[PDB]
Amino acid sequence: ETLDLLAMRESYTRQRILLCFNGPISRSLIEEIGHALRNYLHAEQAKPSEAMDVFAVYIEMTQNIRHYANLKGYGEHEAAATVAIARNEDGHYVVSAGNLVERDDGQSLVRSIQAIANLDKAALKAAYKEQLRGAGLGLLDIARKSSEPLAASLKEQPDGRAFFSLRAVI
Amino acid sequence: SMETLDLLAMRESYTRQRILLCFNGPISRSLIEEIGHALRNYLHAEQAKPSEAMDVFAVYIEMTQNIRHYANLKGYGEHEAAATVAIARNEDGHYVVSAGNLVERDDGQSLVRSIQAIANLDKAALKAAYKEQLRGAGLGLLDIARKSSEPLAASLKERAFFSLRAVI
Amino acid sequence: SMSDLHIPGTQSTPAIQGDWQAGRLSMQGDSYPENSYELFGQVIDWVERFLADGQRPLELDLRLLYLNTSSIKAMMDILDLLEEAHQGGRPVSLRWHYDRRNERVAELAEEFREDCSFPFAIQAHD
Amino acid sequence: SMSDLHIPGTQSTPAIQGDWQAGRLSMQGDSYPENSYELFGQVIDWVERFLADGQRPLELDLRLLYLNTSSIKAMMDILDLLEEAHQGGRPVSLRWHYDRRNERVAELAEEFREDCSFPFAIQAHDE
Numbered sequence A: 001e002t003l004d005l006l007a008m009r010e011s012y013t014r015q016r017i018l019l020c021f022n023g024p025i026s027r028s029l030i031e032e033i034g035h036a037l038r039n040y041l042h043a044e045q046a047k048p049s050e051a052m053d054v055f056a057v058y059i060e061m062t063q064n065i066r067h068y069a070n071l072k073g074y075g076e077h078e079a080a081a082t083v084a085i086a087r088n089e090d091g092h093y094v095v096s097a098g099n100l101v102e103r104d105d106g107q108s109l110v111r112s113i114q115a116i117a118n119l120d121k122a123a124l125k126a127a128y129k130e131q132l133r134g135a136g137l138g139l140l141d142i143a144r145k146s147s148e149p150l151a152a153s154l155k156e157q158p159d160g161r162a163f164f165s166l167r168a169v170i
Numbered sequence B: 001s002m003e004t005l006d007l008l009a010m011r012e013s014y015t016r017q018r019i020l021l022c023f024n025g026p027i028s029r030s031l032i033e034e035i036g037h038a039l040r041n042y043l044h045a046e047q048a049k050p051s052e053a054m055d056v057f058a059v060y061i062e063m064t065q066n067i068r069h070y071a072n073l074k075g076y077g078e079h080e081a082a083a084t085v086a087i088a089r090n091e092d093g094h095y096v097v098s099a100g101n102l103v104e105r106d107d108g109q110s111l112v113r114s115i116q117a118i119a120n121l122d123k124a125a126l127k128a129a130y131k132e133q134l135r136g137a138g139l140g141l142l143d144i145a146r147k148s149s150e151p152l153a154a155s156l157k158e159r160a161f162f163s164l165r166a167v168i
Numbered sequence C: 001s002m003s004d005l006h007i008p009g010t011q012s013t014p015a016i017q018g019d020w021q022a023g024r025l026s027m028q029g030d031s032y033p034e035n036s037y038e039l040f041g042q043v044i045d046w047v048e049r050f051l052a053d054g055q056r057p058l059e060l061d062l063r064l065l066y067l068n069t070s071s072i073k074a075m076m077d078i079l080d081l082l083e084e085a086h087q088g089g090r091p092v093s094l095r096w097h098y099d100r101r102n103e104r105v106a107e108l109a110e111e112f113r114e115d116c117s118f119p120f121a122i123q124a125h126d
Numbered sequence D: 001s002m003s004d005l006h007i008p009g010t011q012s013t014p015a016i017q018g019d020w021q022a023g024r025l026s027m028q029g030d031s032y033p034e035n036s037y038e039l040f041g042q043v044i045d046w047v048e049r050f051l052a053d054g055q056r057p058l059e060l061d062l063r064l065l066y067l068n069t070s071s072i073k074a075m076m077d078i079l080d081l082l083e084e085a086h087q088g089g090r091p092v093s094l095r096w097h098y099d100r101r102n103e104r105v106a107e108l109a110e111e112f113r114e115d116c117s118f119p120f121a122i123q124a125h126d127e
């Protein structure tokens, strides 16, 4: 067939991926992968505030996918996602997640992220504090916790549905 | 962006392989079960016939618990007990369960020889060898071979990377 | 409850009830824990204690589904105690219920029963 | 126990104790449930009830760690009830304990405290 398990394992090594999952993603699956992530961060002697940032970005990105799938009525079977967590050579963690979205939703999402990427930490805080009382707390929190600007991409399809992928560098 | 593009390249590769679920990383007892639950939901959503749904589940659990057993035997901890697991569905509708892990090279070589020796035996010989291990391939590998619609396939790269593939 | 055995079931381990006075051992659910003897160790001891004592019949009523290799070994240890007691003249019996639409449970139960010479029933349900 | 509130904690939800007679609301642990108002709805009701009448002080003793966005909104709803009662003359108080080696919890507690004008303490501990 087409399944090449060694080719994937080597691609994960090339990208320095420590954890990655693809498929239907449930509440309990989110938490259990987060538990593997927290153990890995502890085994790598992550500084306490760095460990919380990486975990927080993982939870919020993956819970945004859950929230979207609920809003669009998707079922357990339909609520699918691709999540990856890597660590750069300099020690910075990279948390990436992707999911299928309606095409109008995907285009409006990349706009909000492009509007988020260029704000400094003080502007991100103000927009965050204002959304406490269009990008919301989740994307704003991920942007605030990143050491690099948030990056997003969108692979459109004449299905009407697009693949949205987001990455944060912690 | 380089990470978002690569995330797209991965997602497209999974599509071309008809992969339903795949995981890579440290694999614990609770992660085995939670991924097994996603598998059981997917099999129901695809209206898998009941004994076929149990065969795929049984092969998934036994493959991944063999990785757990080996990692414990070699003393590995939760951080070193790492694995790559994938479940796909072929064009003909048959499910494919594949799992891979790092092994000592001599262990991996003895493992490939053991799978090559069982893979080509018919169901009656697999049952007898199974029934004999009730009282070298054991019950785990023999059950996966017994539940497969095709001969078990194994490979070894280069600590070596061992990979096992069953078609149900 | 003193001589009885009640174990609640989980996602990967079966629920177990050992009724000492009724001479009945019941199980239900899947069984794929990583170390099955952490679970079945007390069940085997419960059976061994029951079979060393008295002549009262012991019946197993199983509603088991998926069993991994470790659970199958432990199950075979339990059936060897029944078979040992049965060869000595002790009345033992086993009943395995299963959903008629899933043959694999009956096929597994049928493989267990070829190593037994005591009454062993497999009952299909709609 | 009738007017009290005892909620055990889990991996993704905090443990909560509402002591009605002592006027104390305590919470410990992480909080990242998918729908935080399934958890915090009864806590908000408990706070509102305590604050609706009487003059007894209400103090919050928090040992919370990671909160997701939904829990932060629910937490803000609780602190808005404290602030409203405090502007009306009700004595309220909050203490947030945290491990000194993790400044993110102190930073989160500080962001909450900038929207509050009642006594609000952040206490570091050497674990």
Ligand SMILES: Nc1ncnc2c1ncn2[C@@H]1O[C@H](COP(=O)(O)OP(=O)(O)O)[C@@H](O)[C@H]1O
Pocket: A061, A064, A065, A068, A099, A101, A105, A109, A134, A135, A136, A137, A138, A139, A140, A164, D069
């Ligand atoms: N992964 C995603 N897929 C699709 N849409 C998303 C995703 N993440 C966020 N969104 C959308 O972006 C908006 C903002 O997200 P977020 O910052 O988490 O806001 P909030 O915290 O206020 O919910 C949501 O209203 C939703 O439409």
Ligand SMILES: Nc1ncnc2c1ncn2[C@@H]1O[C@H](COP(=O)(O)OP(=O)(O)O)[C@@H](O)[C@H]1O
Pocket: B066, B067, B070, B101, B103, B107, B111, B133, B136, B137, B138, B139, B140, B141, B142, B162, C069
């Ligand atoms: N994924 C794996 N990695 C390394 N060794 C393995 C793996 N799977 C099986 N083995 C080896 O093959 C042997 C037999 O496997 P198995 O058929 O499960 O036997 P049993 O079920 O009797 O343990 C095990 O002792 C183990 O050393």
Ligand code: NA
Pocket: A063, A064, A067, A136, A137, A138, A139, D069
């Ligand atoms: Na959100």
Ligand code: NA
Pocket: B065, B066, B069, B138, B139, B140, B141, C069
């Ligand atoms: Na095995």
